[PDB]
Amino acid sequence: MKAYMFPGQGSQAKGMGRALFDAFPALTARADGVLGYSIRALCQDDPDQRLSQTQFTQPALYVVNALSYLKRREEEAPPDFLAGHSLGEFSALFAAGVFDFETGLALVKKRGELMGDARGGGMAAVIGLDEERVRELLDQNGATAVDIANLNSPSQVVISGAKDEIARLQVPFEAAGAKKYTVLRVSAAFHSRFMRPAMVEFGRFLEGYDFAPPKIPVISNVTARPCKADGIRAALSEQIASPVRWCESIRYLMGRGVEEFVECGHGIVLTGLYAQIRRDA
């Protein structure tokens, strides 16, 4: 069986989507209508240097991912499962028929606004340490204001929390065997307790939307299991303050018999994570 994987923040690049805007001109124009600016220009030229800023990145990735999905639907057999990484969940839910293109874009416009306006904390991407070792290091070094934000592969974990703690933890993490420890340029400590205020505000917005049952199963970042219709609204706000269980989601799919994992959107970030999960699993 086959799964499509939808990428999120950090996977964007100038030039993303270039062929797709002309292939789907009505949807591109409708996105411009929702956003108030040219999505083609943002992705192709980034003329205001804001493609890196999540209030803009989130819509850019959602549009590129959605159009990439529509192109794949035109060209190949349908996927058996869908999974998206954080912002990518919205793409996955669109592909599953949970909401339509414009509705998903409204939700991500808001999500990006709220996350870009959040402040408090920071994040670091760590390569080389497993989850239990990361947990041990947080405990042993007294970093009580740091949470695990992403579980991406057996050796790839993102931590999130107090900026001072994120900075000082580089030393004990490198001493333990972190091959790379990268402090991210982000508005706040995403996927941590620092996002509780934004989570509440996003939940209030999501109350105004309905979520149809998925027509193709979507694996949740929160539970690492297929989404249930009645739980989607709540999960989408919880997600921003909760760990992204990506590694587990992919292992669950492998256990279901998925052998083909295809990234739907720009770049090969999720494909790289898959290779590391496969090698361990």
Automatic annotation (TrEMBL):
Q: Which residues form the Malonyl-CoA:ACP transacylase (MAT) domain?
A: 5-281
Instruction: State the coiled-coil residue ranges.
Output: none
Signal sequence extent:
none
Binding of Ca(2+), residues: 207, 209-210
**What family is this?**
Belongs to the FabD family.
* Identification of the protein by name: [acyl-carrier-protein] S-malonyltransferase
The organism of origin for this protein: Sorangium cellulosum (Polyangium cellulosum)
* Lineage per the UniProt record: Bacteria, Pseudomonadati, Myxococcota, Polyangia, Polyangiales
In the UniProt record, the gene name given for this protein reads dszD
